[PDB]
RNA sequence: GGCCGGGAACUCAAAGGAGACUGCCAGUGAUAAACUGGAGGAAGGUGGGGAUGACGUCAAGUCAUCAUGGCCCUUACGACCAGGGCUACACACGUGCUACAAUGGCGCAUACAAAGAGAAGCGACCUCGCGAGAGCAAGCGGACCUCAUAAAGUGCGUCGUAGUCCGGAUUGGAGUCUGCAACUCGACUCCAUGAAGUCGGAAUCGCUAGUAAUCGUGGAUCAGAAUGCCACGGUGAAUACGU
């Protein structure tokens, strides 16, 4: 079984990422079961402001980076034949992963 | 200090970016360092460009960094040299076969950095701090920016007095989240200490 | 300031490759219990100002060692201006 | 038939299935006295079950993972109430009168930094 | 009567009571009684002579109550009551482990001495 | 002050189905220990029946009438001057202080375990002793005798 | 005492354990390495420990086997 | 084992929403506002939390983060390297943790989470170490591999408060790994160590529901060396009439 990753950041990018691929990575051959979530992963920051006796601040900074699961389990040529005809959504990969 | 920067706290709205791209852990850090090398050596060398912003996008191993600039004819260089030579600069200072992009800034009165550049350009012009200060205020008002409170950093006059310039004009609802206030500052290394300026253009809504 | 200090380790890491990355591993098999020949261990002593434990975790803007982060490794002080201005993607003030 | 309710109480998540008859309660493929057998919280879930009739008419083949003693029970004590709503949509008043309809949204403090338990100020008695 | 010295136990769990011995201790009590093959939750009053006979032999191979604290003692002055840093902390009573020697290490040096 | 809060609504006893008994374990909670209190106070209360030898569902109060408080000091510094001014007990404290009068001398009494040490003091009130009893002996002294300043 | 296997000494004297031990002993050694242990085969040999001003001596025996130097050399002038 | 199919019903998960908005019954109340009793619905009067600190405010502090006027010296109040010291003590204080136990301890059986981290990593597993960890090692680019099992807890005998199997200082011995090398100034393990302290006065401070109280869990910082700090869960009350 092949499981796909969709490395994006925000709704403004992940929204079309999980749908532009399901429409193109499943034309006839692939068994894409629709957009599967793979819930996002989050990391947090502990940031101080001005280096002084004041450890008070400890600002917070979080990163909500999400991934999707188009999951092309079928190595169909036409499903990946149209993979190179689009260039929007700059940083995203079709990771052919088990 | 209780005045958080309004742009980043509103970055969750259409507030733009200047380095948005993707990486794994094995190459966040170096790519971030590559981003600063292009971030710094494109500002000191580009004082006269009146740059609004330089934005880094990294699609795949060949990046599409765009530059927000005031005068379209001046940023071309000697007709494409800076397009190529700075791409030569970035081709190794970032380590990727990058592609440079240049973005215009229509009505540079509408950019908080560029106006703060304009005042700072004339702060060192050896002028007095009040008349020149208010003169620019209405210029934007004649061209929009429906609200700006204008601030100038400390060290005014020959004396120990280092004060602030509050000088509100219009509507700058900082605590209101739906404010999309245009903010950037500017500073000037004066013959006596540090003199800076802070300006908050209000660009309507949404 | 202390750029010489901030450049001190810059030359106390430039030798690490030729000494540790290509020789220490050859002596490292002796170092861990894989046979502890005391005499053979002398070879690693040839470099001193380089060491895996001699990382100074030097912030690459102002050279303070304190304030590192293994993902990138920058002080907490300069990321602040990098935050609102967008230089670090995928970050906004952590409102949870 | 099988009767479905999600249920969630204090970050606890189960899946509660009621079937007519077959009184035995299967919880993580464990008996009543095996998994929730005689603990600090082993009748705190079935107070909504004496107001309604007894064991013999309802089955609980329960998909429950996650939670504490009262947490794995919390996903149940609330999980049962949502999964018996479609069992009978008219008895809603009694449990709302008893309060068991209302979800226990008493979520524990998401801690804030500074104060020790995020709302409790440390010991610096002299000021 | 007494097997080998100090800390004679009475009416306490065999391992729990054998911890009173200073030869054996917190876990040598159970380790040595593992070699004794006796019950553990039983009181020392429950012990008889037929099992404590297997203790004098195993306390000979082990450190005895009376000695244990003496050979550790002059072994310090045997090697490490010279200008040794730790011995500087023994003849004076200060900690050798390198923690903050002023306060919060009160038991090592003794009572508070204002 | 000017605003008020209603009493928090409490489910009944998970074992006897009586809300008053359920509130009782809630006050003894130090270190967050009801599950230990299950082997401490619930093990205590289970033994309170046969040691008492009667149904501890409504006979449970046959040792509490003397404990009924009437007054406590309320610090009214009225106008900036602290006074005695003992206000009569309102229901939100006269019963809370009844539970506050229980385990003041039942932690380290030097016995088997407070799993059953508390199971010693309860029948004592209907056996005419225990911690809850002498609590009312001192309250009578502070009031009803200082009329010139009470 | 922090190795228990593969005991190593710095070349503040290891450079000379092959060069000064062969000469018997000399004036107390110009040794800034109080960190290593002394092996039992340096009986009586004078290793002058740099307390920080200069190099201070220590008296050496053979019941000495796996013990450290800097231990035998106080660093701070108490009082 | 839900293992493969397979449903994605559906826990969980996510791209968008709706739902509480004084919305309504009724009332206090000038009718008003406001307030209250009641109802609805998961959610009644900012549902619950954080983000967001006005004018100002203090020669506040920061030229030791940086930038920064002026003051300096530039074979130097520049620097390289090697020892030590930031932890040294004669004491006082600030903070935290650990206890002072049987609401605990022992071991036995037992079910008990969440968030995270990471192909220069955790390291599965496999052997021993009483352990430290070591020899072997999958897997993964992480809804795929580990940390990581929860923990207090309950039933089992247990001592019935023993300066205590409490507690852990402590010391030296034995060792494990980290790093060349770790006395000062590594950690960790085993052993002996069983001290003061058996709930702390003058007093004083914190505390508003999942609150206190706790129980643990990990993370970052980490060659390495948390009672510090970040983050997550487990259990879970009263006080608040009053100006």
Swiss-Prot record, chain F:
The keyword RNA-binding applies. GO terms for molecular function: rRNA binding; structural constituent of ribosome; tRNA binding. Signal peptide: none annotated. One of its GO terms (cellular component) is small ribosomal subunit. GO terms for biological process: translation. Keywords: Ribonucleoprotein, Ribosomal protein, RNA-binding, rRNA-binding, tRNA-binding. Belongs to the universal ribosomal protein uS7 family. One of the primary rRNA binding proteins, it binds directly to 16S rRNA where it nucleates assembly of the head domain of the 30S subunit. Is located at the subunit interface close to the decoding center, probably blocks exit of the E-site tRNA. Part of the 30S ribosomal subunit. Contacts proteins S9 and S11. This is Small ribosomal subunit protein uS7. It comes from Escherichia coli (strain K12 / MC4100 / BW2952). The lineage of its organism: Bacteria, Pseudomonadati, Pseudomonadota, Gammaproteobacteria, Enterobacterales. The gene is rpsG. The chain holds residues 3 to 152 of 179 of the full protein.
């Amino acid at each position: 079984r092949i499981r796909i990753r969709l490395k994006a950041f925000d709704h403004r990018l992940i929204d079309q990422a999980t749908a532009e691929i399901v429409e193109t990575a499943k034309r006839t051959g692939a068994q894409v079961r629709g957009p599967i979530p793979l819930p996002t992963r989050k990391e947090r920051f502990t940031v101080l402001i001005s280096p002084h006796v004041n450890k008070d601040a400890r600002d917070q900074y979080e990163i909500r980076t999400h991934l999707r699961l188009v999951d092309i389990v079928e190595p169909t040529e036409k499903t990946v034949d149209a993979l190179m005809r689009l260039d929007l959504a700059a940083g995203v990969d079709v990771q052919i992963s088990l | 200090g209780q005045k958080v920067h309004p742009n980043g706290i509103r970055l969750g709205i259409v507030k733009p970016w200047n380095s948005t791209w993707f990486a794994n852990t094995k190459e966040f850090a170096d790519n971030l360092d590559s981003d600063f090398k292009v971030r710094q050596y494109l500002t000191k060398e580009l004082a006269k460009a009146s740059v609004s912003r330089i934005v880094i996008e990294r699609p795949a191993k060949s990046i599409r960094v765009t530059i927000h600039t005031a005068r379209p004819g001046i940023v071309i260089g000697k007709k494409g040299e800076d397009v190529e030579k700075l791409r030569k600069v970035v081709a190794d200072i970032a380590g990727v076969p990058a592609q440079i992009n240049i973005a215009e800034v229509r009505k540079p009165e509408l950019d908080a950095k560029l106006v703060a550049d304009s005042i700072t350009s004339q702060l060192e012009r050896r002028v007095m701090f009040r008349r020149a200060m208010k003169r620019a205020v209405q210029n934007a008002m004649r061209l929009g920016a429906k609200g700006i409170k204008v601030e100038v950093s400390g060290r005014l006059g020959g004396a120990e007095i280092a004060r602030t310039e509050w000088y509100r004009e219009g509507r700058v609802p900082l605590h209101t989240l739906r404010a999309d206030i245009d903010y950037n500052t500017s500073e000037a290394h004066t013959t006596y200490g540090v003199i800076g300026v802070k300006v908050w253009i209000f660009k309507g809504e949404i | 300031a202390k750029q010489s200090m901030k450049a001190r380790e810059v030359k106390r890491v430039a030798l690490a490759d030729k000494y540790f990355a290509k020789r220490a591993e050859l002596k490292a098999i002796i170092s861990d219990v894989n046979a502890r020949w005391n005499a053979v261990l002398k070879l690693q002593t040839l470099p001193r100002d380089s060491s895996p434990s001699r990382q100074r975790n030097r912030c690459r803007q102002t050279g303070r060692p304190h304030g590192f982060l293994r993902k990138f490794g920058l002080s907490r002080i300069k990321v602040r201006e990098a935050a609102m201005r967008g230089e670090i993607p995928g970050l906004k003030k952590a409102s949870w | 038939n099988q009767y479905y309710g999600t249920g969630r109480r204090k970050s606890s998540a189960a899946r509660v299935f009621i079937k007519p008859g077959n009184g035995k309660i299967v919880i993580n493929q464990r008996s009543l006295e095996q998994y929730f057998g005689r603990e600090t919280a082993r009748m705190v879930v079935r107070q909504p079950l004496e107001l309604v009739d007894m064991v013999e008419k309802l089955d609980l083949y329960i998909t429950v993972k996650g939670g504490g003693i009262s947490g794995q029970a919390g996903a149940i004590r609330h999980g049962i109430t949502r999964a018996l709503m479609e069992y009978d949509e008219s008895l809603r008043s009694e449990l709302r009168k008893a309060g068991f309809v209302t979800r226990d949204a008493r979520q524990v403090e998401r801690k804030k930094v500074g104060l020790r338990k995020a709302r409790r100020r440390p010991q610096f008695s002299k000021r | 009567a007494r097997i080998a010295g100090i800390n004679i136990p009475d009416h306490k769990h065999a391992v729990i009571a054998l911890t009173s011995i200073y030869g054996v201790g917190k876990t040598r009590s159970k380790a040595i009684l593992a070699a004794a093959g006796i019950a553990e939750d039983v009181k020392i009053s429950e012990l008889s002579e037929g099992q404590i006979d297997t203790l004098r032999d195993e306390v000979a191979k082990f450190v005895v109550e009376g000695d244990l604290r003496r050979e550790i003692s002059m072994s310090i002055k045997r090697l490490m009551d010279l200008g040794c840093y730790r011995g500087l902390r023994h003849r004076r009573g200060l900690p050798v482990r390198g923690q903050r020697t002023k306060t919060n290490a009160r038991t090592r040096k003794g009572p508070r001495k204002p | 002050r000017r605003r008020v809060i209603g009493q928090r609504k409490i489910l009944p006893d998970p074992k006897f189905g009586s809300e008053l008994l359920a509130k009782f374990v809630n006050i003894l909670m130090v270190d967050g220990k009801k599950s230990t209190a299950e082997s401490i106070v619930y093990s205590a209360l289970e033994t309170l029946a046969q040691r008492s030898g009667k149904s501890e569902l409504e006979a449970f109060e046959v040792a509490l009438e003397n404990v009924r408080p009437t007054v406590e000091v309320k610090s009214r510094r009225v106008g900036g001057s602290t006074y005695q001014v003992p206000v009569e007990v309102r229901p939100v404290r006269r019963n809370a202080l009844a539970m506050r009068w229980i385990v003041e001398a039942a932690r380290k009494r030097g016995d088997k375990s407070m799993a059953l040490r508390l199971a010693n003091e309860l029948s004592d009130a209907a056996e005419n002793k225990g911690t809850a009893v002498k609590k009312r002996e001192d309250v009578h002294r502070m009031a009803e005798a200082n009329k010139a300043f009470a | 005492r922090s190795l228990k296997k593969g005991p190593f000494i710095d070349l503040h004297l290891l450079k000379k354990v092959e060069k000064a031990v062969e000469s018997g002993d000399k004036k107390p050694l110009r040794t800034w390495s109080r960190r290593s242990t002394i092996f039992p085969n340096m009986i009586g040999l004078t290793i002058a420990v740099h307390n920080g001003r200069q190099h201070v001596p220590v008296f050496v025996t053979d019941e000495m086997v796996g013990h450290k130097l800097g231990e035998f050399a106080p660093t701070r002038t108490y009082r």
